[PDB]
Design a binder for this molecule. Structure first.
Ligand SMILES: [Mg+2]
Ligand SMILES: [Zn+2]
Ligand SMILES: [Zn+2]
Lengths: 50, 49, 149, 73, 1330
DNA sequence: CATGACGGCGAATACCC
RNA sequence: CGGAGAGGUA
DNA sequence: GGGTATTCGCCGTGTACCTCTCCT
């Protein structure tokens, strides 16, 4: 969606925006699995487990 | 705000000096479209005439 | 913990993935950090900030243009801008900023008429704020006047 | 003349003198009805004057001489 | 139609002449109607009709009726604008004293009448009497009779004396006194005394009298009798909420004055007890002095809100005053502003301009063209067409702005490149697109910045934009001559990545026909961008004739370097790109292109570099991830070792082995060492990566880590920031500045804890507050510099002077801070620079030293070069091109008419926000030279310095001095002269906690003029037990010892005295009273030992240097050259005398004196240490020395921060600081002796006198601070517009000063062409016709 | 009325003869 | 369309 | 009547722009 310049990270030293980004990806990844199980109409047990 | 899929990479100078490159899908989905309400007043007074 | 959560979602632990250039389809040579960031739109919209003025209203005491976008005012050419123009040697640009773009009423009227006629030439006169200053110094009981020639 | 003026600057010498001579020539073409000495290529009068200057066709001396001739008739 | 501005006092008759009527009523306008009350502040009969060509009565309402004064209502049928030009007058019942000529220090009334200000105030504000005419009684004229004294005096005698009260008394005094006779009396009084303070007071008063006499002003005019009234249209009433008016804040003061005047006049007709009459007179005085200057004397009268009232003096002074708000700067038409975005596709001369903004800006041009092709018959039709935004209107807009430049400005405009001209390109958006390369010139980025756009209207303005202010002409910096369009960030990263090499990249070992084949291989994916290959490269080189000779050869290079070679213009060596290209390398590439090939190839090359850098930075995929902050694997071990070490040295403190102070001092050193170790480990791990060769071997190479690439390229970040990211943040400081004992061992990747983050907030807040508060000081300094240098313009080609300044490399200890090449580049030599052989001339006398000339200088190892300087330039009212030298922005010699003073002020001011707030060992190989040295026999054969404090030079063989070291008194050098040094061994050793009274010749010291127990004491320390002697200080010492001064002579076994050869005065050494005699009497002393013990930065510094501020403890110097002695002591401060007529100076006596009692010193020799006052340097060592001192100190402050500013700007400021001269003797000139005048005036007068053959006056140059120099200029308009408008205008009005419109500020204020640049020639014509 | 600013500088004030 | 107070952007 | 040290009042303290309320 958005392209940000890496060069604004090092001198600014606001490293949190990197970690959040990683964490954000991880968060989306979890949703990307759950959404999949919702489109395949998986059992409630599998969604419970995941 | 909104959750945006973001990549950290230079793109042909369009992210130079803190500039931001935004995909047209962000515009299409109205992710950052905002409503602004302004109040206009029309006053009818007494004048000398 | 972040890398563990990335594993749980079947994502790389480094947080960097292979991206392709949409224009050409070519692989970017190095992995790119791709993720989700929570972005905000600040109340600094370009709609509220963009402003331009050719001519408009003027102040009462000094015939210089009004200030502010809300008043359709003109931009202030302050002391440092004048210093920059002096450092360039752009004497005519500075003079037209001081007179025909400003409180020189006759000069600005003539300049507008000449521009409408396709004649890009100014006929500068005396700025009105200098006359205001002269009157104000007179009001302090001090005789200040221009000389013969 | 359309991107840099260094040719015209070197032709005239002083940069301010170049500005004044170019302004005089551009006014002669904009208001005086004079014809360009160089082939007009959708340029403005200022750019035409600068192009004439950088080719040596217009300077202060040439302008003064031509003004003297024109006033003589 | 005018040539100068005249200012003087206003007589009552002249004030009446200005006015068109008298204002009598204190009510402005009728509120029932909207008409103004007659005879009020907005009266129409006096000031003019409210509407155009119409009466107040409405009888006449046509232009045919123009010129007819209405009989019914008295209003004249004329244009209403006369209301802002016609003034009024207020008749005053009693004379009132003008506040400016009373309270503005020094009091003009007080100085003229010789009375104290307090006395005049008591009399003026009705607290005392003044005996205007005593007659033949015992009362003098300026005697203050208190009310009691007045009545009792009148009782004893109340007819002869004429004591009056109020301003009328001061009126009587000022009118009666004769200026010429009393001036003669003071002039004869001046010579009839010898007291300096009385001379100062008399000359100060006589200056005021002469000011009154020459100007034609009358003293009694300072007391007002008719008060002028400002035109009403200059003090209008702003409507609020339709029906009501706010406080005008100026009409209120006029209302109060009118009311008080009328009530006074009426209580004078009916008559009243004198006390209430005097109260009314006093409050009328208060009303008038509040109207003129509210708050100057007494409390400030307050309006409806608590806000002070804004008076007439406030109209014209301060930041919001007329000068600074409406004359030196103003709002302009044809202007707009918008948020700036990056346009990476733009060429250097183009900007991206919104088409809506352009349509609004160029609207009159659209109207003109629409009528030009007859698309709109009238203005109204064109306006409607533009409002509809028809397609043809957009075609008109396209046609208008084809080659019409626009000016882009970003605030703050710190230097001239903050305004640049660009060719507009219409864009659909609402934001202005800025070219990347000019961003550094604007100090601009795209995180919210906004810029203003202006439209040059006339042909002259358009051509000034194209030829002067266009970005293509501004690639170099005017401050230092370096390129300012240098690529940064993405472009630097892209070029660095494409020019990097890899050990086993795909396609390694290939051999290519040229760059095109390399590009084909890269684009087709058959070869890596970092593959090391062989490429056929054809490069071009200029010959002596100047043609491009082509050489083709096989280069060992990379694919990326070959690809980048395609954009390089012909004429550059291929090696310039045959390396990993960083920011420094790219800047050198651009500078080389400019120097070899000129402006046009440079602009094209810069555009190509930017495009290539953006493209390959995009293709690289350079990112930033958490894994890129690679933390060294030894970090925890180093931290634990440091913690164990600090625990051990805390255990040392527990048992008392170390004190608390040293405990902390060693904990800090230990943690600093640990931080250094962590930083080294992190950088070593980060800067290298391991790669497999084509032979399967593992090989080291430069790392391709993203953050390391960003730092190494120079695109963004430094080693320090990387250390915070991946090493440890380190030691922090408390708000008071002390370092916190425990450092932040974590880094931003690991994350700080609460305590560490809170600790770091201290420094973060301190830095942000420092920036926020220092920006104002930097702006103030810049404004002061601009004023002090505003009028300086290059007005000549060559004044022909043979003087100059001697440039040498800057040497501080081992390292040489500044090469001679940098200091002399672009300078004009003041003499022939002989080749070291001294036979021939290496460069002729007057040569502009460009790159090749400096190449010759450095190649032949020229030691120093004498160059011309603006400070020593002979030109009056400006400088010459040769003395200034090269124009740094352009690269050639400076042109006539260039405003170099403003350029210098901006160059110095701009980096203002970047500013803050026992032995000698040679390190290199070379011979050692000594100057100002005296050598004598030594005990060990190793020479001891006996000369007044000297220096030492290390000259590296070829004759260029690489080192300089200072040598105090008694420092015994460990070697000889010219012995040569390996480097790293001590050259001289001495004790900085003692100083002897050494006598070179050996002998027995005899204690002459010496008394035991009175001038000396014996001590026996328990550790030693020796009977050492203390020479007690005289004030400390007993009364008997005070009369005798200590003395130590030299006698030998022969019995006579051996003394310094060549002199007549015996070698006798007095001890300064802080000396320790360890030896006993009659002890043979060998030369080279002790005979006594004598124990012993940022922006504000630059501001103090430019303000010529005197240091708190300045160094005392030798006023004249001779032998020193003492005299009276304690009676105040110790007296030191110098004589070869004698000099007598007083010195605190709680200071240390380098010189000894019989030590002969030259002029300017340091008597006592301390920071040198630049005034003393100018007085003693001359203009050149003070110029060099100021330049060196300012460059020290700026070089500490890494800021590069040419010395010529500082020299321009110094020359402006040195514009005044004080007359030592009048001579045959017209100058009065002892006054301060302009140095150029003295030069002209002396030149004229020498032409006539008469004798010229002698002068002493005066050094003035930039504020003082600005306020002491001949033009009172400039000084008034700068600061202290009240005081400057009072000076000008009393003196009757005449102001020539000669400087830049004066012509800006009157809206004329400035006498610089394109207007310069204009003023020349104006001079020649006159 | 407000009582959180301070450095520099020149005229005037006082102290010390 | 002037002044004051408050906040904000660079 | 004389010189010098201390005290007191005045001068100055970044640019450009945007929003709001309140004001005889
Ligand atoms: Mg910014
Ligand atoms: Zn009438
Ligand atoms: Zn000169």
């Amino acid at each position: 969606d958005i392209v940000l310049n890496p060069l604004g990270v090092p001198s600014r030293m606001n490293i949190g925006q990197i970690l959040e980004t990683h964490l954000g990806m991880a968060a989306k990844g979890i949703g990307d699995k759950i959404n999949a199980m919702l489109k395949q109409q998986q059992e409630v047990a599998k969604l419970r487990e995941f | 705000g909104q959750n945006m899929r973001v990549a950290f990479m230079p793109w042909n100078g369009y992210n130079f000096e803190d500039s931001i490159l935004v995909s047209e899908r962000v515009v299409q989905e109205d992710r950052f479209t905002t409503i602004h309400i302004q109040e206009l007043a029309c006053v009818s007074r007494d004048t000398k005439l | 913990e972040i890398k563990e959560l990335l594993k749980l979602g079947d994502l790389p632990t480094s947080g960097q993935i292979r991206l392709y250039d949409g224009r050409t389809g070519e692989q970017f040579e190095r992995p790119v950090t791709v993720g989700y960031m929570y972005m905000l739109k600040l109340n600094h919209l370009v709609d509220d900030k963009m402003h331009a003025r050719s001519t408009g209203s003027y102040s009462l005491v000094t015939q210089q243009p009004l200030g502010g976008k809300a008043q359709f005012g003109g931009q202030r050419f302050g002391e440092m801008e004048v210093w920059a123009l002096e450092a360039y040697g752009a004497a005519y640009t500075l003079q037209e900023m001081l007179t025909v773009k400003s409180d020189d009423v006759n000069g600005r009227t003539k300049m507008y008429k000449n521009i409408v006629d396709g004649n890009h030439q100014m006929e500068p006169g005396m700025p009105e704020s200098f006359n205001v200053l002269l009157k104000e110094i007179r009001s302090l009981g001090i005789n200040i006047e221009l000389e013969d020639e | 003349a359309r991107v840099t003026v260094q040719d015209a600057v070197e032709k005239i010498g002083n940069r301010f003198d170049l500005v004044l001579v170019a302004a005089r020539r551009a006014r002669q073409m904009q208001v005086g009805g004079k014809d360009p000495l160089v082939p007009e290529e959708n340029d403005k009068t200022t750019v035409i004057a600068l192009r004439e200057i950088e080719e040596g066709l217009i300077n202060n001396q040439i302008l003064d001489v031509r003004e003297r001739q024109e006033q003589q008739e | 139609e005018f040539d100068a501005i005249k200012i003087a006092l206003a007589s009552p008759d002249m004030i009446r002449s200005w006015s068109f009527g008298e204002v009598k009523k204190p009510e402005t306008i009728n509120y029932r109607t909207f008409k103004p009350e007659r005879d009020g502040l907005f009266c129409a009969r006096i000031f003019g009709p409210v509407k155009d060509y119409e009466c107040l009565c409405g009888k006449y309402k046509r232009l045919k009726h123009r010129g007819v004064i209405c009989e019914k209502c008295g209003v004249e049928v004329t244009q209403t604008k006369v209301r802002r030009e016609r003034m009024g007058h207020i008749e005053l019942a009693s004379p009132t004293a003008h506040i400016w000529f009373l309270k503005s220090l020094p009091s003009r009334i007080g100085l003229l009448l010789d009375m104290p200000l307090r006395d005049i105030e008591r009399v003026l504000y009705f607290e005392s009497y003044v005996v205007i005419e005593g007659g033949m009684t015992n009362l003098e004229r300026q005697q203050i009779l208190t009310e009691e004294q007045y009545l009792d005096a009148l009782e004893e005698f109340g007819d002869e004396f004429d004591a009056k009260m109020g301003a009328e008394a001061i009126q009587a005094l000022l009118k009666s006194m004769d200026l010429e006779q009393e001036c003669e009396q003071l002039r004869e009084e001046l010579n009839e005394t010898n007291s300096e303070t009385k001379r100062k007071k008399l000359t100060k008063r006589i200056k005021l009298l002469e000011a009154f006499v020459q100007s034609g002003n009358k003293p009694e005019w300072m007391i007002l009798t008719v008060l002028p009234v400002l035109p009403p249209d200059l003090r209008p009433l702003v409507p609020l909420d339709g029906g009501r008016f706010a406080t005008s804040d100026l009409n209120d003061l006029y209302r109060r004055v009118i009311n008080r005047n009328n009530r006074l006049k009426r209580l004078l007709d009916l008559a009243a007890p004198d006390i209430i009459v005097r109260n009314e007179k006093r409050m009328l005085q208060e009303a008038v002095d509040a109207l003129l200057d509210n708050g100057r004397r007494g409390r400030a009268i307050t309006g409806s809100n608590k806000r002070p009232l804004k008076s007439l003096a406030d109209m014209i002074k301060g930041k919001q005053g007329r000068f600074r708000q409406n004359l030196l700067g103003k709002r302009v038409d044809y202007s707009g502003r918008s948020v700036i975005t990056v346009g990476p596709y733009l060429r250097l001369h183009q900007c991206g301009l919104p088409k809506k903004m352009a349509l609004e800006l160029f609207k009159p041009f659209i109207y003109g063209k629409l009528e030009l092709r007859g698309l709109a018959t009238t203005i109204k039709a064109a306006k409607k067409m533009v409002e509809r935004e028809e397609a043809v209107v957009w075609d008109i807009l396209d046609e208008v702005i084809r080659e019409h430049p626009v000016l882009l400005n970003r605030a703050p405009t710190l230097h001239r490149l903050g305004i640049q001209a660009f060719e507009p390109v219409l864009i659909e958006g609402k934001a202005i697109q800025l070219h990347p390369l000019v961003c550094a010139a604007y100090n601009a980025d795209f995180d919210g910045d906004q810029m203003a756009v202006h439209v040059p209207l006339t042909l002259e303005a358009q051509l000034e934009a194209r030829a002067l202010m266009m970005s293509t002409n501004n690639i170099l910096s005017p401050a230092n001559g370096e390129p300012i369009i240098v690529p940064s960030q993405d472009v630097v990263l892209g070029l660095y990545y494409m020019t990097r090499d890899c050990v086993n990249a795909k396609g390694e070992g290939m051999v290519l026909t040229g760059p095109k084949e390399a590009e084909r291989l890269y684009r087709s994916g058959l070869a890596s961008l970092h593959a090391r290959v062989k490429v056929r490269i054809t490069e071009y080189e200029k010959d002596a004739n100047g043609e491009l000779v082509a050489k083709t050869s096989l280069k060992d290079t990379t694919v990326g370097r070959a690809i980048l070679w395609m954009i390089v213009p012909k004429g550059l060596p291929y090696s310039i790109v045959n390396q990993a290209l960083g920011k420094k390398a790219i800047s050198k590439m651009l500078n080389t292109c400019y120097r070899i090939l000129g402006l046009k190839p440079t602009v094209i090359f810069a555009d190509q570099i930017m495009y290539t850098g953006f493209a390959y930075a995009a293709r690289s995929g350079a990112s930033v991830g958490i894994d890129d902050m690679v933390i060294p694997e030894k970090k925890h071990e180093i931290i634990s070792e440091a913690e164990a070490e600090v625990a051990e040295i805390q255990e040392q403190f527990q048992s008392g082995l170390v004190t608390a102070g040293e405990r902390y001092n060693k904990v800090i050193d230990i943690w600093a060492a640990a931080n250094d170790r962590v930083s080294k480990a992190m950088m070593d791990n980060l800067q290298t990566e391991t790669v497999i060769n084509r032979d399967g071997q593992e090989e080291k190479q430069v790392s391709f880590n993203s953050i390391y690439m960003m730092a190494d390229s120079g695109a963004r970040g430094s080693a320090a920031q990387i250390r915070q990211l991946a090493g440890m943040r380190g030691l922090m400081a408390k708000p008071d500045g002390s370092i916190i004992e425990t450092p932040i061992t974590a880094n931003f990747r690991e994350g700080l804890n609460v305590l560490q983050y809170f600790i770091s907030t201290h420094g973060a807040r301190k830095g942000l507050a420092d920036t926020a508060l220092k920006t104002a000081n930097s702006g103030y300094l810049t404004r002061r510099l601009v004023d002090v240098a505003q009028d300086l313009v290059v007005t000549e080609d060559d004044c022909g002077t043979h003087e100059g300044i001697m440039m040498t490399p800057v040497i501080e200890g081992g390292d040489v801070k500044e090469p001679l090449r940098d200091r002399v580049l672009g300078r004009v030599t003041a003499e022939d620079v002989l080749k070291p052989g001294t036979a021939d001339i290496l460069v002729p006398r007057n040569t502009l030293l460009h790159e090749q000339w400096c190449d010759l200088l450095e190649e032949n190892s020229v030691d120093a070069v004498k160059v011309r300087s603006v400070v020593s330039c002979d030109t009056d009212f400006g400088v010459c091109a040769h003395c200034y030298g090269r124009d740094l922005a352009r690269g050639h010699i400076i042109n006539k008419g260039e405003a170099i003073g403003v350029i210098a002020a901006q160059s110095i001011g701009e980096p203002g926000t970047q500013l803050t707030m026992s032995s000698i060992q040679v390190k290199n190989k070379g011979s050692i030279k000594l100057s100002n040295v005296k050598s004598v026999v030594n005990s060990s054969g190793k020479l001891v310095i006996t000369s007044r404090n000297t220096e030492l030079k290390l000259i590296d063989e070829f004759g260029r001095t690489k080192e300089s070291y200072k040598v105090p008194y008694g420092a015994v050098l460990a070697k000889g002269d010219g012995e040569q040094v390996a480097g790293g061994e001590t050259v001289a050793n001495w004790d900085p906690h003692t100083m002897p009274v050494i006598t070179e010749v050996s002998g027995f010291v005899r204690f002459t003029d010496m008394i035991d127990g009175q001038t000396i004491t014996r001590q026996t320390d328990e550790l030693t037990g020796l009977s050492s002697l203390v020479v007690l200080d005289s004030a400390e010492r007993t009364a008997g010892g005070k009369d005798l001064r200590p003395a130590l002579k030299i006698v030998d076994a022969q019995g006579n005295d051996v003394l310094i050869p060549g002199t007549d005065m015996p070698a006798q050494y007095f001890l300064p009273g802080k000396a320790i005699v360890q030896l006993e009497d009659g002890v043979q002393i060998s030369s080279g030992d002790t005979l006594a013990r004598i124990p012993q930065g940022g922006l504000p510094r630059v501001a103090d240097l430019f303000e010529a501020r005197r240091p708190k403890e300045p160094a005392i110097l030798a006023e004249i050259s001779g032998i020193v002695s003492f005299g009276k002591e304690t009676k105040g401060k110790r007296r030191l005398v110098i004589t070869p007529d004698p000099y007598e100076e007083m010195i605190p006596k709680w200071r240390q004196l380098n010189v000894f009692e019989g030590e002969r010193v030259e002029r300017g020799d340091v008597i006592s240490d301390g920071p040198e006052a630049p005034h003393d340097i100018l007085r003693l060592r001359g203009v050149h020395a003070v110029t060099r001192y100021i330049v060196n100190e300012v460059q020290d402050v700026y070089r500490l921060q890494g800021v590069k500013i040419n010395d010529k700007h500082i020299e321009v400021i110094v020359r402006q600081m040195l514009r005044k001269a004080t007359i030592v003797n009048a001579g045959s000139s017209d100058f009065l002796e002892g006054e301060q005048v302009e140095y150029s005036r003295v030069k002209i007068a002396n030149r004229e006198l020498e032409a006539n053959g008469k004798v010229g006056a002698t002068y002493s140059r005066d050094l003035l601070g930039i504020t003082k120099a600005s306020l002491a200029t001949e033009s009172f308009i400039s000084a008034a517009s700068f600061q202290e408008t009240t005081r400057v205008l009072t000076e000008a009005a009393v003196a009757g000063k005449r102001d020539e419109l000669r400087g830049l500020k004066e012509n800006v204020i009157v809206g004329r062409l400035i006498p610089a640049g394109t207007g310069y020639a204009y003023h020349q014509d104006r001079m020649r016709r006159r």
